[PDB]
Amino acid sequence: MYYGISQFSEAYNKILRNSSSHSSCQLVIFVSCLNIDALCATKMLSLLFKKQLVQSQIVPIFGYSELRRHYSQLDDNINSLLLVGFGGVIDLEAFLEIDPQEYVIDTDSGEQSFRRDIYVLDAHRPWNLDNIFGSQIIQCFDDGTVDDTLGEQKEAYYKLLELDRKQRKKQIHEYEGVLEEYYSQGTTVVNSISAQIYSLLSAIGETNLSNLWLNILGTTSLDIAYAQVYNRLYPLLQDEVKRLTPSSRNSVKTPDTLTLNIQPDYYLFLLRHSSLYDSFYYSNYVNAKLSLWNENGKKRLHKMFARMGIPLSTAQETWLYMDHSIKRELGIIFDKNLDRYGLQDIIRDGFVRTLGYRGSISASEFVEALTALLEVGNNSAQKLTNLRKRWVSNFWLSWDALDDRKVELLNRGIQLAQDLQRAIFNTGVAILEKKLIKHLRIYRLCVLQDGPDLDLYRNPLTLLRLGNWLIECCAESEDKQLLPMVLASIDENTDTYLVAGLTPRYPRGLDTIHTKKPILNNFSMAFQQITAETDAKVRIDNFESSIIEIRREDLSPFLEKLTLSGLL
């Protein structure tokens, strides 16, 4: 372990001592864009440092190349660096060309001090042992995994470090085997950065309703792909909401009251900001459980609505103007008429925040709006950089959406979320009708070669959204065995693909012994190994490890070698 849960306050105090000078701005926060959890964590840090008047700079970085370029550009005065959402799975001192002898001051006296401190803050579990164990400059905000599940790796790393006959060589190979089996592991996510920073705030005592709301947003960002993590962290948020809500309950509503509530939040898509029919129709879970992509699915949906006794005219009405008779009986109606179709998991408990008279909104809807703003908010090596520039710019739109004074931007985000879900649904029914997903014995490939609005999928977030749609659809099919999926999308302007190796997941709400063990995404190591040999102009720079940009002509040989690769 490097920084446990109980000693986050030590890191915060170290940051304050090193860089809380009003003379200059010696603190720089590197945030990974295209990550809602990192966005909420950086918003928390921004508010916390605004309270203590610690001058700081927030830089959205898209890829590892940008991180390296910025660090090279980074001045030596800046003596505190925060990496939010990345950096925990690579040799940062090696990647950034860091040698501790050039950053050490006042070596003496069993202590050491350095002129610059890098605090990595992410949730991807393959901690690089040369970062968590063998470097003092790099300081990792651990969540308790290393101090409990890395004892063997700690011993193996230290023995090899200190040792630089037959028994000695045999034991070295035995220890080196322990390190090797630690690697060759898929990259998962166990915690949410927002929850970690909220734990730090609880240690410092700066918790309030806005920070709790940011924590809820960051945690709810994990419910789509890491539902086990969200279910693990949910009781803590539930306790915090009860702790922070004022005792003056059942009071009259006033234009100033902000209420965090735990009320039934059905697992539909933008239920409060769109019609009930559109909430069922465009839901990922409902689509998986009913197969609405085919023609018979719409008939099933209409039959369900008739069964509940909700007229289609009322069902398609906007949620605000739905008749108060139906809107107040949603719980009873869903209890009576959902287990018939297997949608019992739709009913759920979530967090809903109302700001005075501005109407309710749930964290699930809020994160969809934020994601939409990230995705569509606003010869070959140059236009791609223009895309990176636009993608960085969208981070600030999603950042400004968090402010309560910019609801006119959150509504635009909601509209963009509805449009993007519509486009995702159209492309999904186009893929599943033409049977574009080629089943294999290693990975179910799927390449998007032509169609409409194909420029949406050059963004990694939109491609992951489509992949999550497909994976949710496949997960509820019993015949289809679990298998990694690959999505690609040709970028005509740059003549390059965007391969996004995904991971399968068990059906939502299905809790078993094998469900408890998380599924690990093995595509990162496979991609890196394939790129190391057989130079193919592959661009592996995303913080999301399992996403690469490959030339149009080099895609097929790359996939051939990947098929020959048994790593994944």
Binding site: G451, P452, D453, D455
Partner: protein, 239 residues
Amino acid sequence: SVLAAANPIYGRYDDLKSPGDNIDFQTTILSRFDMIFIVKDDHNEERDISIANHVINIHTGNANAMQNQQEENGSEISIEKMKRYITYCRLKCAPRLSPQAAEKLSSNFVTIRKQLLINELESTERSSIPITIRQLEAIIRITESLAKLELSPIAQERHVDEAIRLFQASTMDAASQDPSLSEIRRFEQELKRRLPIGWSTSYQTLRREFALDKALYALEKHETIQLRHQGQNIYRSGV
């Protein structure tokens, strides 16, 4: 304002027939219109490929993306925005001509009427497309609209030049359509026999030999001669 779309008799223009035969509209009705566009099907392969590739993109959903991208880029205006801008311009600006603009308009109207007169004299028949004082007012209105869209209170000579170009591209183009014969045949034969196939002769010399000499332009159409040195040299192109 009346924006009327019509069709010449026989469907196609049929330029073999006289320009007055294709258009069945009277001169009175044709005089009201400020700009009388006569479009034609070029049947050009390089343009046909472009049109086909554009129409296919229109059909295969590519329009809904390309037009939106262009509009958000700032090179286009949505209908709901252009409508408001048009209303604002019409209720805010009513440009009036500058004296330098008026001199250009007068001196251009005289040229246009002189060209129409010489065409009528050559053809010995009143032109189907008329040029009248109402067309001078048409050029004035086009100039004022060009200034209006820029909200300029006074119409400079840039707007006059563009209005003149628009009129020449629409109404003069409509009026310039063309379908003695013995003189043409004699000229073609004598220059074919006298001027060799590979050499060139200067045009002043042909004038000495002698008119309007539309025969040279007709031969240029047939690609047997070619005016190259700024019209001062007539070169037998090889036919």
